[PDB]
Amino acid sequence: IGIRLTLPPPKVVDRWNEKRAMFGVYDNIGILGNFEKHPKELIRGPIWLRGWKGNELQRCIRKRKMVGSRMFADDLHNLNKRIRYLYKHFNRHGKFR
Amino acid sequence: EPVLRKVELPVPTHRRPVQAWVESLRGFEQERVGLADLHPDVFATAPRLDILHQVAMWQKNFKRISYAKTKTRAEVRGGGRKPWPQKGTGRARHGSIRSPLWRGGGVAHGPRGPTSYYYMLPMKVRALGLKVALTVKLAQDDLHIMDSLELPTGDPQYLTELAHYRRWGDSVLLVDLTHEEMPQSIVEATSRLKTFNLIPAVGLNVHSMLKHQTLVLTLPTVAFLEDKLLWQDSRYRPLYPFSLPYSDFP
Amino acid sequence: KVEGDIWALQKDVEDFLSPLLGKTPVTQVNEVTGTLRIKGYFDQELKAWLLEKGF
Amino acid sequence: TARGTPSRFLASVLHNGLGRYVQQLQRLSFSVSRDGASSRGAREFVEREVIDFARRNPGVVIYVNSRPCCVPRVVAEYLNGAVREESIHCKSVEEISTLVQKLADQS
Amino acid sequence: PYMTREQERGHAAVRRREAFEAIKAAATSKFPPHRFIADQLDHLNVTKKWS
Amino acid sequence: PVRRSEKPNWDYHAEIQAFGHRLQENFSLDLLKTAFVNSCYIKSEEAKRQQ
Amino acid sequence: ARALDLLRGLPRVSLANLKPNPGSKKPERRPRGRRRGRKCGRGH
Amino acid sequence: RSRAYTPPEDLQSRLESYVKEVFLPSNWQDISLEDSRLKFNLLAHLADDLGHVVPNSRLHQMCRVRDVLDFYNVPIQDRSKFDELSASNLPPNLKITWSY
Ligand SMILES: [Mg+2]
């Protein structure tokens, strides 16, 4: 059917462990540190999208203009494909016109 | 002996001084040694829990950038031709065996792209809310501010037994003036504090401000936070980015 | 940036406004935000009323 | 609907229309957790209404087992030998009193 | 009819003025809500523990 | 079907006072507590004391 | 100033309380259902 | 290691004695708390004799000696709920337990 059969694995999760303990510690970095470095650098994440959060089409546009010459050919053709798709997607057919 | 740590910035006359006891971790059963104050802008502003929830959101969404993706009507493998005879059978024709209507194809409007939600929102307001949460911890019988975060002992059990003896709370976050100048004994004992934590100067922030049951601020560091909130108080129109030199920046 | 028992300031603003337009003041405080707002622009005279209050 | 469900005519415990108001609520067991969110307002009954409840009609079995549990519970049994279980999850203190008295005036 | 055509002309005007005034007084009192802060504090208090 | 003596929230003194109050007719609590006891359970408990 | 003490009249303001201000965001209605949407932004 | 507090009987007299140890003039309750080290010593003696000081969040509202006596005259009854509700002497129709 569509249910489980027994009670599932017991969710051993310590909500108070170290790798979550400092979650945002030293993360008011800018005005609480005499303006040396903004929070706009403290994020450890991909350089395609580290803090210019536009739309989906914008997301891909930034991915291209940042790292396109660093992809295998499948990713380049893929990013080009969806970029063409989205450029057609924005201004063609929708609810508000 | 006594000690009276007033605030350096002149708090206005439209409120009295914001005073409390001054503590220390030196005495294992000897607290309440000295008493001092702070400006109303430091620990006695309006309650303003809404600002605190704003601080909560700007915290919990600050850096997370999820990576979950999918495939579109051209991404997953296969699909260029008409899949089967469109009208010979009684079935349904399609465009592909690789569109999102069949068993294996597309997750049509799923989260495309490793997305991010950074928010460098109003930083002075973030400061005021950080002050607000500090004030909340002040009134909530939680702001036990110590003179200096020295460790009179090396055992973490000394800290645990004092904390149960002080009836501080179930969780503790103690923060100092300088990380290199943080006392070696305090951090060494603190390294096994499985639920308590120690923190440097800039780290006083919102999710941290809810994180423990109570926070233990160092006295000169408390003044440092006051000065920071004071520079947060009445910031003129920025015409240059405040990382470079100014007239009186430090 | 109002502070204190703001409802008294609302009553005072209605009283000053009472001769100003006759109708009762359409005003709302923002108790969490610690503010007072009056429908309509009675601005310069309100600044005068606060100035004559001196504080 | 109705015809898909059974029937049971209007009667009493022991033909008590004559003798006396033989109040038919032998047992009733609310319970709250020491750290329990949903039973918080129900704790209010455990604060206020339960003493008032036994004041109003002491002749019933009032139970607060009050386990460190997940939700409030009402265990009603009576001289009719049946039992009805009443959830009180996320209810109001006024609603707690309403549930209590409505359970009381039943059979 | 119990009276002439011009006989009760205006015979119910003062109450008409009163009714129009009442409609005008009660009608247009739409404006921003007035919000207390203790209500926000109480909604904060809703996660209350026992003793 | 186990007896209600073997479920939660039972107290013999409490149930005895319930036996007093529920009928809205008073009684001597010690006398009634004795009265609810027959002798078969007395024999059963006396035999159970031997094990 | 009754504000701080009135706040002191509750338990510790934990993370379980930071409510968005009433009027933060209008409800994110999925364009469907028995009341809001039957054709979802296009009509018949 | 106990938060339990009871107001003493000689509180006004011991308070006047501690005030004299802190400072002289009439109207003892009208002495304000603008002074710093005097406030420190006064609260120190009051806590040392009493065993119960005001909350540090309550220190800022402490501005005079009358409220200082009053908060020291305020009874603080504290117990667990399984200890407090049970000790309210509820009627025989219920005996609640909190096995936590
Ligand atoms: Mg697939």
Swiss-Prot record, chain A:
Disulphide bridges = none
Q: Which UniProt keywords apply?
A: Mitochondrion, Ribonucleoprotein, Ribosomal protein, Transit peptide
Q: Name one GO cellular component term.
A: mitochondrial ribosome
Its domain of life reads: Eukaryota
Q: Which GO terms describe its biological process?
A: mitochondrial translation; translation
Q: Which GO terms describe its molecular function?
A: structural constituent of ribosome
Q: What is its main location?
A: mitochondrion
Where does this protein reside within or beyond the cell?
Answer: Mitochondrion
Instruction: Give the similarity note.
Output: Belongs to the mitochondrion-specific ribosomal protein mL51 family.
Instruction: Tell me the subunit arrangement.
Output: Component of the mitochondrial large ribosomal subunit (mt-LSU). Mature mammalian 55S mitochondrial ribosomes consist of a small (28S) and a large (39S) subunit. The 28S small subunit contains a 12S ribosomal RNA (12S mt-rRNA) and 30 different proteins. The 39S large subunit contains a 16S rRNA (16S mt-rRNA), a copy of mitochondrial valine transfer RNA (mt-tRNA(Val)), which plays an integral structural role, and 52 different proteins. Interacts with OXA1L.
What is the name attached to this protein's record?
A: Large ribosomal subunit protein mL51
Per the UniProt record, the source organism is Homo sapiens (Human)
Which part of the entire sequence is included in the shown chain? 32 to 128 of 128
UniProtKB/Swiss-Prot annotation, chain D:
Cell location: Mitochondrion
Q: Where are the transmembrane segments?
A: none
- Tissue expression pattern: High relative levels in skeletal muscle and testis. Lower levels of expression in the heart, brain, placenta, lung, liver, kidney, pancreas, spleen, thymus, prostate, ovary, small intestine, colon and leukocytes. Expression is coregulated with TWNK.
Q: How does it assemble?
A: Component of the mitochondrial large ribosomal subunit (mt-LSU). Mature mammalian 55S mitochondrial ribosomes consist of a small (28S) and a large (39S) subunit. The 28S small subunit contains a 12S ribosomal RNA (12S mt-rRNA) and 30 different proteins. The 39S large subunit contains a 16S rRNA (16S mt-rRNA), a copy of mitochondrial valine transfer RNA (mt-tRNA(Val)), which plays an integral structural role, and 52 different proteins.
Tell me which family the UniProt entry assigns to this protein.
Belongs to the mitochondrion-specific ribosomal protein mL43 family.
- What name goes with this protein? Large ribosomal subunit protein mL43
- Lineage of this protein's species? Eukaryota, Metazoa, Chordata, Craniata, Vertebrata
Q: Which residues of the full protein are shown?
A: 2 to 108 of 215
UniProtKB/Swiss-Prot annotation, chain E:
Cell compartments where the protein resides: Mitochondrion
**GO CC annotation terms, alphabetical:** mitochondrial inner membrane; mitochondrial large ribosomal subunit; mitochondrial ribosome; mitochondrion
Q: Which domain of life is it from?
A: Eukaryota
Provide the GO MF annotations for this entry: structural constituent of ribosome
What are the UniProt keywords, alphabetically? Mitochondrion, Ribonucleoprotein, Ribosomal protein
Specify where it is mainly localized: mitochondrion
* A Gene Ontology biological process term: mitochondrial translation
Instruction: Provide the transmembrane region boundaries.
Output: none
The record's similarity note reads: Belongs to the mitochondrion-specific ribosomal protein mL63 family.
Query: What is the protein's quaternary organization?
Result: Component of the mitochondrial large ribosomal subunit (mt-LSU). Mature mammalian 55S mitochondrial ribosomes consist of a small (28S) and a large (39S) subunit. The 28S small subunit contains a 12S ribosomal RNA (12S mt-rRNA) and 30 different proteins. The 39S large subunit contains a 16S rRNA (16S mt-rRNA), a copy of mitochondrial valine transfer RNA (mt-tRNA(Val)), which plays an integral structural role, and 52 different proteins.
- Listed name of the protein: Large ribosomal subunit protein mL63
Q: Which residues of the full protein are shown?
A: 52 to 102 of 102
From Swiss-Prot, chain H:
| Annotated keywords | Mitochondrion, Ribonucleoprotein, Ribosomal protein
User: Which residue windows are transmembrane per the record?
Assistant: none
**A GO CC term?**
mitochondrial large ribosomal subunit
Name of the protein in question: Large ribosomal subunit protein mL50
Q: Which family does it belong to?
A: Belongs to the mitochondrion-specific ribosomal protein mL50 family.
Cellular compartments annotated: Mitochondrion
Main localisation, per the record?
A: mitochondrion
Organism whose genome encodes this protein: Homo sapiens
Quaternary form? Answer: Component of the mitochondrial large ribosomal subunit (mt-LSU). Mature mammalian 55S mitochondrial ribosomes consist of a small (28S) and a large (39S) subunit. The 28S small subunit contains a 12S ribosomal RNA (12S mt-rRNA) and 30 different proteins. The 39S large subunit contains a 16S rRNA (16S mt-rRNA), a copy of mitochondrial valine transfer RNA (mt-tRNA(Val)), which plays an integral structural role, and 52 different proteins.
GO biological process annotation, one example: mitochondrial translation
Top-rank taxon: Eukaryota
Q: Which residues of the full protein are shown?
A: 56 to 158 of 158
**Gene that this sequence comes from:** MRPL50
